[PDB]
Amino acid sequence: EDLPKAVVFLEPQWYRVLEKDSVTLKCQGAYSPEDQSTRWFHNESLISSQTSSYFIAAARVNNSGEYRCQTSLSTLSDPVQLEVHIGWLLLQAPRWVFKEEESIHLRCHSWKNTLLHKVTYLQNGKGRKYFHQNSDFYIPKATLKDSGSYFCRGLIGSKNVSSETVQIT
Amino acid sequence: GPSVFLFPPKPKDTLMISRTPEVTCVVVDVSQEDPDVKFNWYVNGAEVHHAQTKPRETQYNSTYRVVSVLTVTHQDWLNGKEYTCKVSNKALPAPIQKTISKDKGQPREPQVYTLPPSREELTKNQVSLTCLVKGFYPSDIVVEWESSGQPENTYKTTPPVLDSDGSYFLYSKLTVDKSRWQQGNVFSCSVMHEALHNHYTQKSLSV
Amino acid sequence: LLGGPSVFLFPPKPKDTLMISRTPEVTCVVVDVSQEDPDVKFNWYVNGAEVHHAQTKPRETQYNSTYRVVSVLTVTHQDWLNGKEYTCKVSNKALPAPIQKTISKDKGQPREPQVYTLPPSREELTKNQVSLTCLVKGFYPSDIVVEWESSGQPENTYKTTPPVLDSDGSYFLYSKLTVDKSRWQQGNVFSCSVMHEALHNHYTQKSLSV
Ligand SMILES: *[C@@H]1O[C@H](CO[C@@H]2O[C@@H](C)[C@@H](O)[C@@H](O)[C@@H]2O)[C@@H](O[C@@H]2O[C@H](CO)[C@@H](O[C@@H]3O[C@H](CO[C@H]4O[C@H](CO)[C@@H](O)[C@H](O)[C@@H]4O[C@@H]4O[C@H](CO)[C@@H](O)[C@H](O)[C@H]4NC(C)=O)[C@@H](O)[C@H](O[C@H]4O[C@H](CO)[C@@H](O)[C@H](O)[C@@H]4O[C@@H]4O[C@H](CO)[C@@H](O)[C@H](O)[C@H]4NC(C)=O)[C@@H]3O)[C@H](O)[C@H]2NC(C)=O)[C@H](O)[C@H]1NC(C)=O
Ligand SMILES: *[C@@H]1O[C@H](CO[C@@H]2O[C@@H](C)[C@@H](O)[C@@H](O)[C@@H]2O)[C@@H](O[C@@H]2O[C@H](CO)[C@@H](O[C@@H]3O[C@H](CO[C@H]4O[C@H](CO)[C@@H](O)[C@H](O)[C@@H]4O[C@@H]4O[C@H](CO)[C@@H](O)[C@H](O)[C@H]4NC(C)=O)[C@@H](O)[C@H](O[C@H]4O[C@H](CO)[C@@H](O)[C@H](O)[C@@H]4O[C@@H]4O[C@H](CO)[C@@H](O)[C@H](O)[C@H]4NC(C)=O)[C@@H]3O)[C@H](O)[C@H]2NC(C)=O)[C@H](O)[C@H]1NC(C)=O
Ligand SMILES: *[C@@H]1O[C@H](CO)[C@@H](O)[C@H](O)[C@H]1NC(C)=O
Ligand SMILES: *[C@@H]1O[C@H](CO)[C@@H](O)[C@H](O)[C@H]1NC(C)=O
């Protein structure tokens, strides 16, 4: 316990991201007091970009794992995990640790921002809130058995497509 | 937007007069907000409010399933009056509409035959009657079996198939105990359709 | 247009799969392919396998502007209806996932489909045309083949019913061959041939007459 520990913030607020989305990482806590420094850490390694942000325009599999950031100070940022799954739809989330109560904000993410029709989110096989076009599912206050598997199904033009299990307890 | 699937009245219901038939119009896939939809049914073009509806049945997808009835008079649906469901919803920018009538054209009487159990299929456990309906159209037919005077249990029906000369046929099978058939009982294959001795006939069989 | 293309994979037809020496197919249609030159590239498996069993047949388009592609697979006999799985593993630039359907399946309760044919029915004798009937029951592998012969020519104007689920869970079906009154009262021999998975050398016929 020495300097204030920097940490890692995401762009956007999702970590399970697909095979050709844009993602941008950035760092706080730190900041080279005059000449912005970075030293990003990928899987416990190093990258040359020198920008206080970090681009990944064409994210693909090899861009998953653990990322960290250490500017001039920044102690050593505790790790952040980044996931990429191949496919069509996904259930993008900010957190996966919801005991008793916090905020829940889920996105049934498409692919190449191509729109969806008749998307629904699911509570362990059961439906909860269906919308016609694409949109996000928000809930404040937990329901003590959302503790379970969530995913979403949608119809792209006509092809009917599903996503993958995400159990949040 | 939401989708509607205009179902037709059950044949048996519109054949004869025992149960008043209905032309069900179902609107599925509508959300918890922007539900509330009205129906301007058209029977060739005259609205008339007398079109009762079912409650907001919820389905395992939050999706409200609004249903609606329209009691069509027994004597009309056979003339072919084109019945029209019209739904308008905030989710649908434009109203959608579906109209359906008599399976159009002109019919044909389906004189029916009752083929007996084949000879070799008797020296075995239970045996099978057959009732062959042939040469008709459209597919608004119903086949039932009767014994003595009460409808029989163990029977299945083949779906209609398109014959060579633009007509349908089916083979109604009835399994009966060899003991209950060989000794001798009376079994009648009855059929209802829109082109017979005023909607009905039946053909018996024994030995 | 577009929206992501699709795949379809069907089994072979029953006559080709059962009877020996009739090359059984297996096809993969890829419908709704178009405009921006998305290409082919297939690869089959049985649970680990190899190509060499296809080569596409050009680009049917006709009407809705979608470069339609299909390719085959020459299957064995003592192989299929025996366990193997089959996958097509399609891929394409516009589809962001090498997806593919599987097949095989329809399994279980095969047994003697002892076939029972019938004569015309009394009143039928008046009209110029009477129909012979052939019922099959006692078979569960969902599909089956049924044909007719009269001494020895494919009578090509019968009609056959589609199978349905009987009581005990063994499918049953019917067939109807229409002949003029004169040909049935002549005394010709008619045979209702049936082929299914569970028969001696896979065949039966119940020659019928008066
Ligand atoms: C939310 O959940 C509900 C329900 O959930 C599920 O419901 C069923 C299906 C089970 O799987 C349950 O386990 C499960 O919980 C979803 O609502 C469903 O949505 C689908 C749409 O994909 C509808 O499918 C349609 O079905 C009709 C036939 O409907 C009969 O059969 C159904 C399945 O067997 C049965 O469930 C129905 O009750 C119905 O049964 C008849 O019902 C009527 C009255 O309702 C009754 O009088 C009869 O007695 C009764 N008879 C029997 C034997 O049951 C079918 O017609 C539809 O086909 C149309 O569309 C196809 C695709 O385009 C096409 O291939 C067809 O040809 C046909 O197309 C139309 O055809 C003619 C001209 O050819 C014409 O009308 C049109 O021009 C043409 N095109 C169009 C677009 O109409 C289709 O297969 C389900 O019925 C429906 N279930 C309901 C309402 O209960 C809902 O989708 C879910 N939401 C989400 C987001 O997932
Ligand atoms: C643009 O191009 C063409 C336009 O052609 C059009 O064809 C029809 C629709 C008419 O409108 C024409 O006027 C017009 O020209 C479109 O290409 C077609 O697209 C349709 C659907 O959009 C496909 O339909 C599928 O057909 C399969 C079965 O396919 C056989 O039968 C067809 C007719 O029944 C026949 O046309 C096909 O050629 C094919 O026939 C086989 O052909 C091969 C080739 O040589 C031959 O070797 C075989 O012997 C022969 N066999 C037979 C029996 O004929 C059908 O299975 C599909 O149904 C699936 O989806 C339904 C809804 O999801 C579902 O109810 C079905 O059960 C099935 O779904 C799957 O079912 C099982 C479980 O039940 C399981 O696998 C899955 O869980 C389940 N779901 C899925 C997703 O798999 C469907 O009906 C045509 O095949 C296709 N190609 C043609 C016609 O050549 C094209 O779509 C157009 N584009 C657009 C955007 O519209
Ligand atoms: C980062 O870690 C992931 C998951 O362990 C791995 O697949 C990937 O290859 C790693 N990146 C590099 C550049 O090795
Ligand atoms: C489409 O997805 C839903 C579940 O996600 C299911 O009802 C339906 O069977 C699916 N269709 C296919 C072809 O898998």
Numbering used by the authors:
A (entry chain C): 3 to 171
B (entry chain A): 237 to 443
C (entry chain B): 234 to 443
Quote the study's own text.
In these mechanisms, the effectiveness of inactivation depends upon Fc gamma receptors (FcγRs) expressed at the surface of effector cells and the interaction of the extracellular domain of the FcγR with the Fc portion of the antibody bound to its cognate epitope. In contrast to humans, macaques only have one low affinity FcγRIII receptor, CD16, which shares a polymorphism at position 158 with human FcγRIIIa with Ile158 and Val158 variants. Similar to human low affinity FcγR receptors, the macaque FcγRIII receptor consists of two immunoglobulin-like domains packed against one another at a roughly 80-90 degree angle in a comma- or apostrophe-like shape. The Mm FcγRIII forms an asymmetric complex with macaque IgG1 Fc with the Fc binding near the bend in the comma-shaped receptor; the majority of the receptor’s contact residues to the Fc reside on the C-terminal second immunoglobulin-like (d2) domain closer to the cell membrane.
